[PDB]
Design a binder for this molecule. Structure first.
Ligand SMILES: *CCCN(CC[C@H](N)C(=O)O)C[C@H]1O[C@@H](n2cnc3c(N)ncnc32)[C@H](O)[C@@H]1O
Length: 275
Protein backbone atom coordinates (compact mmCIF):
# COMPACT_ATOMS: atom_id res chain seq x y z
CA UNK A 1 0.00 0.00 0.00
CA UNK A 2 3.16 2.28 0.22
CA UNK A 3 4.75 3.35 -3.11
CA UNK A 4 8.48 2.91 -3.56
CA UNK A 5 11.05 5.71 -3.73
CA UNK A 6 13.88 5.86 -6.27
CA UNK A 7 16.73 8.34 -6.44
CA UNK A 8 17.12 7.79 -10.17
CA UNK A 9 13.42 7.85 -11.11
CA UNK A 10 12.94 10.14 -14.08
CA UNK A 11 16.61 10.73 -14.69
CA UNK A 12 18.00 11.27 -18.21
CA UNK A 13 18.20 7.52 -18.82
CA UNK A 14 14.57 7.06 -17.80
CA UNK A 15 13.52 9.98 -20.05
CA UNK A 16 15.27 8.39 -23.04
CA UNK A 17 13.97 4.87 -22.47
CA UNK A 18 10.38 5.75 -21.65
CA UNK A 19 10.44 8.07 -24.68
CA UNK A 20 11.46 5.20 -26.97
CA UNK A 21 8.96 2.86 -25.33
CA UNK A 22 6.15 5.37 -25.78
CA UNK A 23 7.01 5.92 -29.41
CA UNK A 24 7.08 2.19 -30.12
CA UNK A 25 3.73 1.63 -28.41
CA UNK A 26 2.08 4.48 -30.30
CA UNK A 27 3.45 3.04 -33.53
CA UNK A 28 1.87 -0.29 -32.53
CA UNK A 29 -1.52 1.36 -31.90
CA UNK A 30 -1.77 2.53 -35.53
CA UNK A 31 -3.33 -0.82 -36.42
CA UNK A 32 -6.44 -1.35 -34.29
CA UNK A 33 -5.33 -5.05 -33.84
CA UNK A 34 -3.96 -6.15 -30.38
CA UNK A 35 -0.35 -6.57 -29.25
CA UNK A 36 1.60 -7.64 -26.19
CA UNK A 37 3.96 -5.60 -24.00
CA UNK A 38 6.46 -7.87 -22.24
CA UNK A 39 8.52 -6.20 -19.50
CA UNK A 40 11.26 -8.46 -18.10
CA UNK A 41 12.60 -6.13 -15.36
CA UNK A 42 9.46 -4.19 -14.54
CA UNK A 43 10.07 -2.68 -11.08
CA UNK A 44 7.27 -1.47 -8.85
CA UNK A 45 5.11 0.59 -11.25
CA UNK A 46 5.60 4.11 -9.96
CA UNK A 47 7.92 6.01 -7.65
CA UNK A 48 7.21 8.67 -5.08
CA UNK A 49 9.62 11.47 -5.91
CA UNK A 50 11.98 12.85 -3.26
CA UNK A 51 12.12 12.26 0.50
CA UNK A 52 10.10 13.52 3.49
CA UNK A 53 15.69 15.89 -3.42
CA UNK A 54 16.29 13.56 -6.45
CA UNK A 55 17.84 13.07 -9.95
CA UNK A 56 14.39 13.65 -11.56
CA UNK A 57 15.16 17.41 -11.03
CA UNK A 58 17.88 17.10 -13.77
CA UNK A 59 15.66 14.80 -15.94
CA UNK A 60 11.88 14.66 -16.46
CA UNK A 61 11.77 18.03 -14.66
CA UNK A 62 13.75 19.86 -17.37
CA UNK A 63 11.32 18.88 -20.18
CA UNK A 64 7.81 18.10 -19.04
CA UNK A 65 6.54 21.69 -18.88
CA UNK A 66 8.54 23.11 -21.78
CA UNK A 67 6.43 25.28 -24.13
CA UNK A 68 8.31 23.95 -27.24
CA UNK A 69 7.99 20.24 -26.32
CA UNK A 70 8.53 18.21 -29.48
CA UNK A 71 5.32 16.59 -30.67
CA UNK A 72 6.79 13.09 -30.54
CA UNK A 73 7.29 13.39 -26.75
CA UNK A 74 3.64 14.34 -26.10
CA UNK A 75 2.29 10.84 -25.39
CA UNK A 76 5.07 10.28 -22.76
CA UNK A 77 4.68 13.66 -20.94
CA UNK A 78 0.85 13.13 -20.96
CA UNK A 79 1.41 9.86 -18.92
CA UNK A 80 3.70 11.73 -16.43
CA UNK A 81 1.04 14.56 -16.17
CA UNK A 82 -1.74 11.94 -15.47
CA UNK A 83 0.34 10.76 -12.42
CA UNK A 84 1.03 14.48 -11.43
CA UNK A 85 -2.24 16.51 -12.00
CA UNK A 86 -1.22 19.15 -9.34
CA UNK A 87 1.35 20.43 -11.94
CA UNK A 88 4.17 19.37 -9.52
CA UNK A 89 6.44 16.29 -10.04
CA UNK A 90 5.54 14.21 -6.90
CA UNK A 91 5.38 10.79 -8.75
CA UNK A 92 7.19 9.25 -11.80
CA UNK A 93 5.60 6.41 -13.89
CA UNK A 94 7.49 3.23 -14.49
CA UNK A 95 7.54 1.40 -17.80
CA UNK A 96 4.65 -0.85 -16.66
CA UNK A 97 2.52 2.21 -15.88
CA UNK A 98 3.72 3.82 -19.10
CA UNK A 99 2.38 0.64 -20.72
CA UNK A 100 -0.81 0.55 -18.64
CA UNK A 101 -1.95 4.03 -19.69
CA UNK A 102 -0.91 3.89 -23.36
CA UNK A 103 -2.21 0.39 -24.13
CA UNK A 104 -5.89 -0.05 -25.14
CA UNK A 105 -8.51 -2.39 -23.60
CA UNK A 106 -7.76 -5.16 -26.10
CA UNK A 107 -4.02 -5.16 -25.52
CA UNK A 108 -1.90 -7.37 -23.26
CA UNK A 109 0.83 -6.84 -20.70
CA UNK A 110 3.28 -9.42 -19.37
CA UNK A 111 5.25 -8.13 -16.39
CA UNK A 112 7.91 -9.87 -14.27
CA UNK A 113 9.79 -8.64 -11.22
CA UNK A 114 11.78 -10.87 -8.87
CA UNK A 115 12.42 -8.63 -5.82
CA UNK A 116 9.98 -9.19 -2.93
CA UNK A 117 9.80 -5.48 -2.15
CA UNK A 118 8.40 -4.34 -5.53
CA UNK A 119 6.41 -7.32 -6.75
CA UNK A 120 3.61 -6.57 -4.24
CA UNK A 121 3.30 -2.95 -5.38
CA UNK A 122 3.46 -3.93 -9.05
CA UNK A 123 0.82 -6.66 -8.52
CA UNK A 124 -1.48 -4.02 -7.00
CA UNK A 125 -0.99 -1.66 -9.98
CA UNK A 126 -2.66 -4.30 -12.19
CA UNK A 127 -4.85 -5.83 -9.45
CA UNK A 128 -7.96 -4.73 -11.32
CA UNK A 129 -6.44 -4.93 -14.82
CA UNK A 130 -6.97 -8.28 -16.51
CA UNK A 131 -4.83 -7.29 -19.50
CA UNK A 132 -1.66 -7.92 -17.48
CA UNK A 133 0.05 -10.83 -15.73
CA UNK A 134 2.54 -10.09 -12.98
CA UNK A 135 4.86 -12.78 -11.67
CA UNK A 136 7.79 -12.84 -9.25
CA UNK A 137 10.18 -14.69 -11.54
CA UNK A 138 13.26 -14.16 -13.69
CA UNK A 139 12.25 -12.05 -16.72
CA UNK A 140 14.93 -13.47 -19.06
CA UNK A 141 12.97 -16.75 -18.89
CA UNK A 142 9.70 -15.02 -19.85
CA UNK A 143 11.34 -14.59 -23.27
CA UNK A 144 11.26 -18.40 -23.67
CA UNK A 145 7.92 -18.98 -21.89
CA UNK A 146 5.67 -16.07 -23.02
CA UNK A 147 6.59 -15.76 -26.72
CA UNK A 148 5.21 -15.62 -29.35
CA UNK A 149 2.08 -13.85 -28.13
CA UNK A 150 -1.14 -15.04 -29.62
CA UNK A 151 -1.61 -11.60 -31.24
CA UNK A 152 1.70 -12.04 -33.17
CA UNK A 153 2.58 -8.37 -32.66
CA UNK A 154 4.37 -6.91 -29.59
CA UNK A 155 7.13 -4.97 -27.86
CA UNK A 156 9.52 -6.62 -25.42
CA UNK A 157 11.24 -4.13 -23.01
CA UNK A 158 14.44 -5.54 -21.43
CA UNK A 159 15.69 -3.02 -18.87
CA UNK A 160 18.07 -4.78 -16.51
CA UNK A 161 19.93 -3.14 -13.62
CA UNK A 162 23.38 -4.40 -14.63
CA UNK A 163 24.25 -5.05 -10.99
CA UNK A 164 25.97 -8.28 -12.11
CA UNK A 165 28.21 -8.19 -15.20
CA UNK A 166 26.49 -11.35 -16.47
CA UNK A 167 23.57 -9.08 -17.35
CA UNK A 168 25.67 -7.83 -20.25
CA UNK A 169 25.66 -11.44 -21.50
CA UNK A 170 22.22 -12.50 -20.32
CA UNK A 171 20.37 -9.82 -22.39
CA UNK A 172 21.98 -10.93 -25.64
CA UNK A 173 21.39 -14.68 -24.92
CA UNK A 174 17.81 -13.81 -23.86
CA UNK A 175 17.07 -11.79 -26.99
CA UNK A 176 18.13 -14.74 -29.10
CA UNK A 177 15.74 -17.10 -27.30
CA UNK A 178 13.03 -14.48 -27.71
CA UNK A 179 13.86 -13.89 -31.41
CA UNK A 180 13.87 -17.62 -32.34
CA UNK A 181 10.25 -17.85 -31.07
CA UNK A 182 8.94 -14.37 -32.11
CA UNK A 183 11.14 -12.96 -34.90
CA UNK A 184 8.74 -10.17 -35.92
CA UNK A 185 8.36 -8.48 -32.54
CA UNK A 186 10.15 -5.30 -31.50
CA UNK A 187 12.75 -5.84 -28.80
CA UNK A 188 14.04 -2.81 -26.84
CA UNK A 189 17.20 -3.16 -24.72
CA UNK A 190 18.35 -0.47 -22.33
CA UNK A 191 22.04 -0.17 -21.41
CA UNK A 192 24.12 2.08 -19.19
CA UNK A 193 27.51 3.19 -20.48
CA UNK A 194 29.90 2.95 -17.55
CA UNK A 195 32.76 1.22 -19.43
CA UNK A 196 32.27 1.39 -23.19
CA UNK A 197 34.33 -1.80 -23.78
CA UNK A 198 31.62 -3.66 -21.85
CA UNK A 199 28.95 -2.23 -24.17
CA UNK A 200 31.01 -2.94 -27.32
CA UNK A 201 31.28 -6.57 -26.30
CA UNK A 202 27.49 -6.77 -25.82
CA UNK A 203 26.87 -5.24 -29.23
CA UNK A 204 29.43 -7.53 -30.90
CA UNK A 205 27.75 -10.53 -29.26
CA UNK A 206 24.39 -9.22 -30.50
CA UNK A 207 25.33 -8.94 -34.19
CA UNK A 208 26.91 -12.40 -33.75
CA UNK A 209 23.45 -13.85 -33.13
CA UNK A 210 22.69 -12.79 -36.67
CA UNK A 211 19.64 -10.69 -35.88
CA UNK A 212 19.14 -7.91 -38.42
CA UNK A 213 17.28 -4.59 -38.49
CA UNK A 214 19.01 -3.40 -35.28
CA UNK A 215 18.97 0.32 -34.32
CA UNK A 216 20.85 2.28 -31.67
CA UNK A 217 19.90 5.42 -29.78
CA UNK A 218 22.20 6.90 -27.17
CA UNK A 219 22.14 10.01 -24.98
CA UNK A 220 25.49 10.76 -23.30
CA UNK A 221 25.89 13.40 -20.61
CA UNK A 222 29.73 13.18 -20.78
CA UNK A 223 32.19 11.79 -23.36
CA UNK A 224 33.09 8.19 -22.50
CA UNK A 225 34.98 7.98 -19.16
CA UNK A 226 36.05 5.61 -16.35
CA UNK A 227 36.39 8.08 -13.42
CA UNK A 228 32.76 9.19 -13.83
CA UNK A 229 30.36 6.25 -13.93
CA UNK A 230 27.26 6.36 -16.15
CA UNK A 231 28.34 8.93 -18.75
CA UNK A 232 25.57 7.69 -21.08
CA UNK A 233 22.63 5.34 -21.60
CA UNK A 234 20.97 4.12 -24.73
CA UNK A 235 18.35 1.89 -26.34
CA UNK A 236 19.10 -0.87 -28.86
CA UNK A 237 15.86 -1.55 -30.74
CA UNK A 238 15.41 -4.67 -32.88
CA UNK A 239 12.70 -4.65 -35.57
CA UNK A 240 11.92 -0.95 -34.84
CA UNK A 241 8.95 0.88 -36.29
CA UNK A 242 10.05 2.61 -39.46
CA UNK A 243 9.48 6.12 -38.11
CA UNK A 244 11.39 5.57 -34.87
CA UNK A 245 14.75 6.69 -36.38
CA UNK A 246 13.34 10.00 -37.87
CA UNK A 247 11.42 10.49 -34.58
CA UNK A 248 14.68 10.06 -32.60
CA UNK A 249 16.63 12.38 -34.91
CA UNK A 250 13.86 14.99 -34.57
CA UNK A 251 13.78 14.57 -30.75
CA UNK A 252 17.06 13.47 -29.23
CA UNK A 253 18.94 16.76 -29.99
CA UNK A 254 16.22 18.74 -28.18
CA UNK A 255 16.28 16.18 -25.34
CA UNK A 256 20.05 16.51 -24.94
CA UNK A 257 19.86 20.33 -24.85
CA UNK A 258 17.26 20.35 -22.07
CA UNK A 259 18.57 17.46 -19.97
CA UNK A 260 22.24 18.44 -20.47
CA UNK A 261 22.28 22.25 -20.45
CA UNK A 262 26.08 22.35 -19.93
CA UNK A 263 26.70 21.17 -23.49
CA UNK A 264 28.56 17.94 -22.79
CA UNK A 265 28.25 14.52 -24.38
CA UNK A 266 26.43 13.60 -27.55
CA UNK A 267 23.10 12.33 -28.88
CA UNK A 268 23.48 9.65 -31.56
CA UNK A 269 21.04 7.58 -33.59
CA UNK A 270 22.68 4.88 -35.71
CA UNK A 271 22.21 1.39 -37.17
CA UNK A 272 24.10 -1.45 -35.53
CA UNK A 273 22.89 -3.88 -38.21
CA UNK A 274 21.08 -2.79 -41.42
CA UNK A 275 17.95 -4.61 -42.59
C1 LIG B 1 17.60 0.11 -14.90
C2 LIG B 1 16.65 -0.99 -14.35
C3 LIG B 1 15.96 -0.64 -12.97
N1 LIG B 1 14.88 -1.63 -12.63
C4 LIG B 1 13.68 -1.58 -13.54
C5 LIG B 1 13.15 -0.14 -13.80
C6 LIG B 1 11.65 -0.14 -14.33
N2 LIG B 1 11.49 -1.19 -15.34
C7 LIG B 1 11.32 1.21 -14.97
O1 LIG B 1 11.20 1.23 -16.20
O2 LIG B 1 11.21 2.26 -14.29
C8 LIG B 1 15.42 -3.03 -12.49
C9 LIG B 1 14.40 -3.96 -11.72
O3 LIG B 1 14.58 -5.18 -12.06
C10 LIG B 1 14.60 -6.10 -10.75
N3 LIG B 1 15.31 -7.32 -11.18
C11 LIG B 1 16.58 -7.63 -11.05
N4 LIG B 1 16.80 -8.80 -11.63
C12 LIG B 1 15.65 -9.23 -12.14
C13 LIG B 1 15.24 -10.36 -12.85
N5 LIG B 1 16.21 -11.41 -13.18
N6 LIG B 1 13.97 -10.46 -13.22
C14 LIG B 1 13.08 -9.53 -12.94
N7 LIG B 1 13.44 -8.45 -12.28
C15 LIG B 1 14.70 -8.29 -11.88
C16 LIG B 1 15.13 -5.31 -9.77
O4 LIG B 1 14.74 -5.68 -8.44
C17 LIG B 1 14.61 -3.90 -10.13
O5 LIG B 1 13.45 -3.58 -9.41
Amino acid sequence: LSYRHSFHAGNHADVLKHTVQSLIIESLKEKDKPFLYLDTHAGAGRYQLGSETGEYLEGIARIWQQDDLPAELEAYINVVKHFNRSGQLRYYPGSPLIARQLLREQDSLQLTELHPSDYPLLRSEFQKDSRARVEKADGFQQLKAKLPPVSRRGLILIDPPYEMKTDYQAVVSGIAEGYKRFATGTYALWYPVVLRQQIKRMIHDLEATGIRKILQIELAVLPDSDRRGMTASGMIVINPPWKLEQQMNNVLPWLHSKLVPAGTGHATVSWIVPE
